[PDB]
Amino acid sequence: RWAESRGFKTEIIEESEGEVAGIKSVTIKISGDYAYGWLRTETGVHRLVRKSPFDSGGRRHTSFSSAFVYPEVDDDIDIEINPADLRIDVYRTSGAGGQHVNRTES
Amino acid sequence: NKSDIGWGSQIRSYVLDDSRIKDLRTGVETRNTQAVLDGSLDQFIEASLKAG
RNA sequence: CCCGCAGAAGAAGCACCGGCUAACUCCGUGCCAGCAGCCGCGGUAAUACGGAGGGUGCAAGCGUUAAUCGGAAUUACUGGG
RNA sequence: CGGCCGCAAGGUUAAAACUCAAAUGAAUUGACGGGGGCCCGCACAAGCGGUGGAGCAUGUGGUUUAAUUCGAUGCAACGCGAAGAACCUUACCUGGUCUUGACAUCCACGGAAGUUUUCAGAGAUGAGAAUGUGCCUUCGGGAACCGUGAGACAGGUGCUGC
RNA sequence: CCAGGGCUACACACGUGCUACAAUGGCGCAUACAAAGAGAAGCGACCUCGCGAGAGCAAGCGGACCUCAUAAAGUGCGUCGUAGUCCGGAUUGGAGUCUGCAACUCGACUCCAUGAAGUCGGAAUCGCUAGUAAUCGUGGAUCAGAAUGCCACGGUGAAUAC
């Protein structure tokens, strides 16, 4: 809801609803300007103190969930071959035949 | 780095005993929880996270 | 050891304060920072966390840690099942 | 672990490091049992009429939104608070304004109060042209009434039913 | 403090109601039979105009008397004759009345036209043993205006309980 106010579209990525209720692990894709830069600071673990209905004796039990933010952008490996290496070794290796041959293999 | 999931990092405490939100990293206290749950997150970055 | 002058002048901190174990309130932070020998408190209205005042115990000592014994009739001959 | 025994499987003898401040026995009062006996009730059995299927009425969630106030939210919330939302109500939003204030007391001041009514204006308000010029007088003013300077406060449908 | 707006927003689901899917019924004419209540900046004769909601004059009563108020089902007879039909009725265009500063978001009601869903409801589930179920009608509070919501009464009136 905060991202919509920032114009960012929150593209769903992964989710897994619990057997009874609630989601276990969820990740989404926020797309926009200053999305990561403004969220790079929000890699915290929030603390929740709420009245628990699941506990028959409705008492305030704490609850925890971590907010992890990563850029997700990825540009990688192209070519790393350089001329400062490659000691090219070309040596032979014998073989087999029928009478007197040295079937070599460089 | 994100291993601390349980009772390790209490960045933003959201209570319902008195309905008060406290980001201890600075101390930006707000008694308007529901709006924070729907938009009042902008204030956390600009004020609290301004200095870091 | 005794005699003369001298400005109260040169000479007071340590531990604890929920119960066990004598003795309290307020404020700050809110299962966070911390306390402890033990039972257990701190989860926004804390006699236990920290500071301030006050008070209790001791007193040039006061706490802490380690160690032996009694408490322990939980090695029982005395004195157990 | 070692010793011993055994064909083997293992048996026999027998510790510690470490961890917690409990483990355990009998019994008591409730609770609970696809335990039992008895009993009660539209529980089911025997019938009758509905809901869910349809159009619309109304509430909530969800979604949306400047707000679409907030609370109730298994049985025992959901035609509930609301014995009734076009303004009002309304606790909501936006805009425009007043801010010892809208309600109220004390210190100090001028003026009967009120009213016909005009301009700007969405309104709240500001600034006027005049009539009227009253109960009584410690007569340098006690009092229903309007506004004002300012120090105490007022108000709160703001939160907390743990 | 105030105008306007929202609380009635809408790709969705659920709770709670009114009327039917027809012929024990609809339409038409004549027509008998109730209890309890409310009334004054109120209810309103009689009468007059009209298709209608209502407009106007306006006695009586601040009340067992006057008014609201013609009870509706049902009964005699005629028509329709088993259809998505003359059963049913939302939606929709246009023309009006009521209260109110104001009916556009956003009211109730009326007139003309239009006229679908629906042909007795799956898994499943709810209420009731008495003048109760089911079913038709009326008044009041709430209220400036306006409910099928709520409260209350009357008409008709079963089966089963081994």
Next chain:
RNA sequence: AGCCAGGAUGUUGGCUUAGAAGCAGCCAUCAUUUAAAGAAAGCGUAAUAGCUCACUGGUCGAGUCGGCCUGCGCGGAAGA
């Protein structure tokens, strides 16, 4: 073309305010006094001073200077 001198007044030129003075860094690419000097390539270059080529006269004063069409040659051309 060698040689002997000149090669400058504001300009310590803006500067993105302790800064690069023709010269790591981007610019208008000045008005002048003149037989005379482009606010610009290299050297120490953080910045200097200073040494040069453009440019101006005196001497040597005849063919000279910059290119083109072509012939023959040099370097490039190092292994059992």
Next chain:
RNA sequence: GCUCAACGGAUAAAAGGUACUCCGGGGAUAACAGGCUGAUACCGCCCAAGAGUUCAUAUCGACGGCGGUGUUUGGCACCUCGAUGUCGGCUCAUCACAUCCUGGGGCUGAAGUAGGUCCCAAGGGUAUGGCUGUUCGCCAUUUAAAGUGGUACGCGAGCUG
């Protein structure tokens, strides 16, 4: 007309292995070596931003180009299939220079010293072992240096298998 997998159709009925192999032939046709070539490999030059503190001509050097040697792998079948009969090690060598050292010099971002880079030069010297069937290669310890190649990938009518 079934009918000719190869479609002028060995009768329209038909797959493999052979490293004891054997016989007849071929360098008409392969493997090692030599030969022509030089794609590739190797080495040497040209243009030249950039990197490097400033500056490319201290060095390296992209973008592409121009040649050489005949040591890698290959291309083509010229020589040998009435035999050129073997990879490495051992012993013994010999030549080239594009030099691993030692010598003589130029340049520097060569202070000193130690290095880097380039030119001249073949005179002489250019390790011992662990592991592998080894060349190569890795490691250990040195050394002034433990050079790069040719010589049937030198050398088996000299040895080993």
Next chain:
RNA sequence: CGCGGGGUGGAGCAGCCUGGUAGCUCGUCGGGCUCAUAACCCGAAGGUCGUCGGUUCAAAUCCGGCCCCCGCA
């Protein structure tokens, strides 16, 4: 730079071969069941079939170009 299998609800397989006419399982939505969930039961939307073209009263279908993956070389 050869021959071949395939691209079908979100996922995974028939349906094609012999030209019309896509079934089922899981998942999704909701209801009911218990206080809640699972399970169970009922009802239902959701796939013209990677992409382009020809043929036909009609092509995901018969066939071919382009892209991704896989088998042997």
Next chain:
RNA sequence: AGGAGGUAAAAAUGUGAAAA
């Protein structure tokens, strides 16, 4: 009193903080 015959397929699960 003395004592026999007929008489239940399937139904799992619920993290964690309060008592002067």
